[PDB]
């Protein structure tokens, strides 16, 4: 089975949290640091394309 | 989260707006978009004048 | 010229306010609202190919 | 922006954190990472007596 077609659409996932959780704040300033580390991709790598 | 059965989620639970409405995500992590899938498309002898 | 194979990174580009700004959350929302209006993907199709 | 003389940044602005430190981004509407810009190596030809 494979991909036929490109995506419809830009679009995304993002960590969620309840309204108002403090959680929220913290989460996005870490995925900009995860980000300029390379970690959201390298874990990409290590569960897509290593496996 | 919205009933707090949980404190946060974690999960390809895919970014809506009306979903945000009741919760709040985060900065995305990557992009990603809408797609199918099928069986896919074989190898097989070509024509007979190829 | 020619772009050179894919993205290098994640680099993207977001809505700014100052911190704290009110308008924060509605223009979250109006920009979220254009993603599946497909507004955003038409005008980069004008932008870019239908030019 | 941290300066309060102007109000919303609609424009070609990335989303990093050492700007977020100080003010706010939203929800980022398409991907568009580094790339390389080269040059074309000129353009390829055919010949009339190739
Ligand atoms: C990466 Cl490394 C990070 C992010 C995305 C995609 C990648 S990649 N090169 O495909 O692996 S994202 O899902 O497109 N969204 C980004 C946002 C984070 C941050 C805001 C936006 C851009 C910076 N993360
Ligand atoms: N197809 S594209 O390059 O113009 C592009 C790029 C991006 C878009 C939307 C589009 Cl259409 N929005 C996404 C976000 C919007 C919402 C949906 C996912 C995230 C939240 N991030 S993005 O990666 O910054």
Redesign the interface.
Known sequence: TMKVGGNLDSKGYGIATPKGSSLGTPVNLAVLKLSEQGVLDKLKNKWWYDK | ??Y?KA????A??????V??E????????????????????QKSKPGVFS
Chains 1, 3 share one sequence.
């Open positions: 989260l919205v707090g404190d946060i989620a974690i390809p639970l895919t970014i809506t707006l979903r945000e009741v919760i709040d995500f985060s900065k995305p992590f990557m992009s990603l978009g809408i797609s199918i899938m099928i069986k896919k498309p």
